[PDB]
Design a protein around this motif. Sequence first.
Motif, PDB file in Angstrom:
ATOM      1  N   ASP A   3     -13.634   2.077   5.285  1.00  0.00           N
ATOM      2  CA  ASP A   3     -12.609   3.068   4.954  1.00  0.00           C
ATOM      3  C   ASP A   3     -11.892   2.749   3.647  1.00  0.00           C
ATOM      4  OD1 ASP A   3     -13.232   4.715   7.044  1.00  0.00           O
ATOM      5  OD2 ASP A   3     -11.532   4.134   8.323  1.00  0.00           O
ATOM      6  N   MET A   4     -11.660   1.460   3.421  1.00  0.00           N
ATOM      7  CA  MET A   4     -11.049   0.981   2.195  1.00  0.00           C
ATOM      8  C   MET A   4     -11.987   1.338   1.036  1.00  0.00           C
ATOM      9  SD  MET A   4      -8.128  -0.203   2.435  1.00  0.00           S
ATOM     10  CE  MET A   4      -7.998  -0.702   0.685  1.00  0.00           C
TER      11      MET A   4
ATOM     12  N   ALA B 208     -11.431  10.856  -8.657  1.00  0.00           N
ATOM     13  CA  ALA B 208     -10.299  11.604  -9.179  1.00  0.00           C
ATOM     14  C   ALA B 208     -10.218  11.234 -10.659  1.00  0.00           C
ATOM     15  CB  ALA B 208      -9.009  11.220  -8.445  1.00  0.00           C
TER      16      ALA B 208
ATOM     17  N   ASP C  55      -8.848  14.713  -4.338  1.00  0.00           N
ATOM     18  CA  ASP C  55      -9.438  13.378  -4.220  1.00  0.00           C
ATOM     19  C   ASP C  55      -8.398  12.292  -3.952  1.00  0.00           C
ATOM     20  OD1 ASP C  55     -12.038  14.204  -4.436  1.00  0.00           O
ATOM     21  OD2 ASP C  55     -12.077  14.085  -6.636  1.00  0.00           O
ATOM     22  N   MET C  56      -7.278  12.348  -4.655  1.00  0.00           N
ATOM     23  CA  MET C  56      -6.239  11.366  -4.437  1.00  0.00           C
ATOM     24  C   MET C  56      -5.731  11.467  -2.999  1.00  0.00           C
ATOM     25  SD  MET C  56      -6.128   9.469  -6.998  1.00  0.00           S
ATOM     26  CE  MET C  56      -4.832   8.542  -6.136  1.00  0.00           C
TER      27      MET C  56
ATOM     28  N   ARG D 203      -5.783   5.254   7.081  1.00  0.00           N
ATOM     29  CA  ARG D 203      -6.583   5.066   8.278  1.00  0.00           C
ATOM     30  C   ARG D 203      -6.931   3.580   8.442  1.00  0.00           C
ATOM     31  NH1 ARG D 203     -12.567   7.184   8.989  1.00  0.00           N
ATOM     32  NH2 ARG D 203     -11.975   9.392   9.268  1.00  0.00           N
ATOM     33  N   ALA D 204      -7.274   2.914   7.338  1.00  0.00           N
ATOM     34  CA  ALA D 204      -7.610   1.491   7.385  1.00  0.00           C
ATOM     35  C   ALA D 204      -6.499   0.669   8.047  1.00  0.00           C
ATOM     36  CB  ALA D 204      -7.874   0.966   5.986  1.00  0.00           C
ATOM     37  N   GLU D 205      -5.301   0.708   7.475  1.00  0.00           N
ATOM     38  CA  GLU D 205      -4.186  -0.050   8.024  1.00  0.00           C
ATOM     39  C   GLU D 205      -3.788   0.441   9.413  1.00  0.00           C
ATOM     40  OE1 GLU D 205      -2.321  -2.701   6.168  1.00  0.00           O
ATOM     41  OE2 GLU D 205      -4.338  -2.658   5.309  1.00  0.00           O
TER      42      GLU D 205
ATOM     43  N   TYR E 113     -12.995   7.833  -3.522  1.00  0.00           N
ATOM     44  CA  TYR E 113     -12.287   9.067  -3.854  1.00  0.00           C
ATOM     45  C   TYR E 113     -11.310   8.851  -5.011  1.00  0.00           C
ATOM     46  CZ  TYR E 113     -14.270  11.657   0.091  1.00  0.00           C
ATOM     47  OH  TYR E 113     -15.126  12.300   0.941  1.00  0.00           O
ATOM     48  N   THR E 114     -10.617   7.715  -5.004  1.00  0.00           N
ATOM     49  CA  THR E 114      -9.688   7.424  -6.086  1.00  0.00           C
ATOM     50  C   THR E 114     -10.487   7.413  -7.387  1.00  0.00           C
ATOM     51  OG1 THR E 114      -8.335   6.012  -4.633  1.00  0.00           O
ATOM     52  CG2 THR E 114      -7.986   5.788  -6.998  1.00  0.00           C
TER      53      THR E 114
ATOM     54  N   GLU F 254       1.851   7.504  -6.725  1.00  0.00           N
ATOM     55  CA  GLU F 254       0.853   8.542  -6.882  1.00  0.00           C
ATOM     56  C   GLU F 254       1.442   9.922  -6.629  1.00  0.00           C
ATOM     57  OE1 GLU F 254      -2.433   6.308  -8.196  1.00  0.00           O
ATOM     58  OE2 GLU F 254      -2.120   8.482  -7.955  1.00  0.00           O
TER      59      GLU F 254
ATOM     60  N   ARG G 228      -7.322  12.648  -0.306  1.00  0.00           N
ATOM     61  CA  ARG G 228      -8.336  12.171   0.626  1.00  0.00           C
ATOM     62  C   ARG G 228      -8.325  10.667   0.565  1.00  0.00           C
ATOM     63  NH1 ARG G 228     -12.769  14.638   2.425  1.00  0.00           N
ATOM     64  NH2 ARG G 228     -13.195  14.113   4.622  1.00  0.00           N
ATOM     65  N   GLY G 229      -8.183  10.148  -0.649  1.00  0.00           N
ATOM     66  CA  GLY G 229      -8.120   8.717  -0.845  1.00  0.00           C
ATOM     67  C   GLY G 229      -6.999   8.106  -0.015  1.00  0.00           C
TER      68      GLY G 229
ATOM     69  N   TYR H 228      -8.013   7.609   3.890  1.00  0.00           N
ATOM     70  CA  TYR H 228      -8.773   6.419   4.245  1.00  0.00           C
ATOM     71  C   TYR H 228      -7.938   5.155   4.131  1.00  0.00           C
ATOM     72  CZ  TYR H 228     -12.735   9.538   4.424  1.00  0.00           C
ATOM     73  OH  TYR H 228     -13.575  10.572   4.767  1.00  0.00           O
ATOM     74  N   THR H 229      -7.148   5.074   3.073  1.00  0.00           N
ATOM     75  CA  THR H 229      -6.263   3.937   2.866  1.00  0.00           C
ATOM     76  C   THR H 229      -5.350   3.772   4.089  1.00  0.00           C
ATOM     77  OG1 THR H 229      -6.226   4.301   0.478  1.00  0.00           O
ATOM     78  CG2 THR H 229      -4.426   3.022   1.449  1.00  0.00           C
TER      79      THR H 229
ATOM     80  N   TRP I  81       2.534   1.859  -3.411  1.00  0.00           N
ATOM     81  CA  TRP I  81       1.606   2.386  -4.399  1.00  0.00           C
ATOM     82  C   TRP I  81       1.309   3.869  -4.145  1.00  0.00           C
ATOM     83  CZ3 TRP I  81       0.053   1.428  -9.083  1.00  0.00           C
ATOM     84  CH2 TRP I  81      -1.092   2.081  -9.575  1.00  0.00           C
TER      85      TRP I  81
ATOM     86  N   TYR J 254      -5.341  -8.221   9.769  1.00  0.00           N
ATOM     87  CA  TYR J 254      -6.482  -8.431   8.863  1.00  0.00           C
ATOM     88  C   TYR J 254      -7.616  -9.202   9.517  1.00  0.00           C
ATOM     89  CZ  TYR J 254      -4.312  -6.557   4.623  1.00  0.00           C
ATOM     90  OH  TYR J 254      -3.742  -5.713   3.693  1.00  0.00           O
TER      91      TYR J 254
ATOM     92  N   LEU K 270       2.456  16.550 -12.714  1.00  0.00           N
ATOM     93  CA  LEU K 270       1.319  17.384 -13.065  1.00  0.00           C
ATOM     94  C   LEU K 270       1.486  18.799 -12.565  1.00  0.00           C
ATOM     95  CD1 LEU K 270      -1.725  15.075 -12.399  1.00  0.00           C
ATOM     96  CD2 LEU K 270      -0.307  15.244 -14.435  1.00  0.00           C
TER      97      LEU K 270
ATOM     98  N   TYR L 103      -8.721  16.787  -8.660  1.00  0.00           N
ATOM     99  CA  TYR L 103      -8.129  15.460  -8.764  1.00  0.00           C
ATOM    100  C   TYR L 103      -7.180  15.233  -7.574  1.00  0.00           C
ATOM    101  CZ  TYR L 103      -4.508  12.112 -10.061  1.00  0.00           C
ATOM    102  OH  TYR L 103      -3.621  11.066  -9.987  1.00  0.00           O
TER     103      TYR L 103
ATOM    104  N   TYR M 192     -12.727  -1.155   8.770  1.00  0.00           N
ATOM    105  CA  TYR M 192     -11.623  -1.327   7.825  1.00  0.00           C
ATOM    106  C   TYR M 192     -12.151  -1.430   6.394  1.00  0.00           C
ATOM    107  CZ  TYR M 192      -7.904  -3.681   5.188  1.00  0.00           C
ATOM    108  OH  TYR M 192      -6.981  -3.995   4.215  1.00  0.00           O
TER     109      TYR M 192
ATOM    110  N   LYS N 258       0.813  -1.214   0.000  1.00  0.00           N
ATOM    111  CA  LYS N 258       0.000   0.000   0.000  1.00  0.00           C
ATOM    112  C   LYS N 258       0.845   1.262   0.000  1.00  0.00           C
ATOM    113  CE  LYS N 258      -4.306  -1.720   2.101  1.00  0.00           C
ATOM    114  NZ  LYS N 258      -5.335  -1.516   3.157  1.00  0.00           N
TER     115      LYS N 258
ATOM    116  N   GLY O  34     -12.083   4.993   0.430  1.00  0.00           N
ATOM    117  CA  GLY O  34     -10.884   5.374  -0.295  1.00  0.00           C
ATOM    118  C   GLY O  34     -10.962   5.071  -1.781  1.00  0.00           C
TER     119      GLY O  34
ATOM    120  N   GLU P 260     -12.858  12.725 -12.521  1.00  0.00           N
ATOM    121  CA  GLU P 260     -12.569  14.160 -12.544  1.00  0.00           C
ATOM    122  C   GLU P 260     -11.619  14.521 -13.698  1.00  0.00           C
ATOM    123  OE1 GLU P 260     -14.325  16.587 -11.524  1.00  0.00           O
ATOM    124  OE2 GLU P 260     -14.035  16.429  -9.354  1.00  0.00           O
TER     125      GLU P 260
END
Lengths: 158, 158
Positions: free
Chosen positions: B136-137, B147, A136-137, A146-148, B143-144, A52, A139-140, A143-144, A48, A158, A59, A133, B133, A45, B140, B150
């Motif tokens: 939130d995933m 984007a 959004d990425m 926050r999950a882990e 939002y991705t 981004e 914010r994305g 959550y990603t 990745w 898990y 950009l 954009y 979990y 995660k 996420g 968008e």
Amino acid sequence: GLPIEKMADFSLEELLGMAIKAEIGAREFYKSLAEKIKIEALKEKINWLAEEEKKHEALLRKLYSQMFPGKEVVFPKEHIGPELQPVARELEKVQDIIDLIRWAMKAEEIAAEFYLKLEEMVKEEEKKRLMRYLADMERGHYYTLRAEYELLLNWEMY
Amino acid sequence: GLPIEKMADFSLEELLGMAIKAEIGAREFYKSLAEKIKIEALKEKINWLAEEEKKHEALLRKLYSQMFPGKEVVFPKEHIGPELQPVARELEKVQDIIDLIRWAMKAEEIAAEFYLKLEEMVKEEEKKRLMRYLADMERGHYYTLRAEYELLLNWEMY
């Protein structure tokens, strides 16, 4: 760093140059964070997320040139929100991971606020989508992360 | 399908069955979406997103097994939120890619909101942690996806 409310004290060019720098910092940050994990799940995660942030700079480097032709991006000596530094040491305790994950999302949460406001201080619908954009990425990634986050904390896998 | 509001019309097991069903169709929805894209970038995003949600099914099946040992999963005919069907046709225009991404974030929208409720509609902290979990995933992925949507707007327009 400085609160999001005071972006009004900076010019649009410095705000763009600020974003680029911030974007480069997160990039190497996430790069260095993932490097030291040894956790077959989190390291993915984070990696990745580094990619981004890689494109965000591309950009932003582009837009900046569009709004400022023939100019050389001059990174301001001041910034908004927390500025993450690349992890050099080693992660001894699971607690360290937490500490870094809590601050990462803390930086992503503010980065989104940064682009939402930047969306306003900009015209021409095309540049608005762009900022949209990036928000959004960002914010994305919130959550990603926050999950882990919650998992590592409760010492659950898990 | 049915609005999130009418989740009370079903049991915890029925809902969990719905969840599993949604995640199954989702996975195969993204698999076909990426498959048909010809956009060395979005197919990338859509592919990472498909992988991420692959473990959702097995995760839910485990929970359903944890709260209903011995009982086989039951899938109700009804279903909350949009039901994504696998993409088999060829995408001819950008609008087609637009539609499919728009529906995907919609489905992710109702999904995270779903796991948010299921979180409260269940007891025991460990179990509500799985819901959180998952939510939130999903939040996420939402939002991705926006984007992308968008930035896909700059493509055509007028």
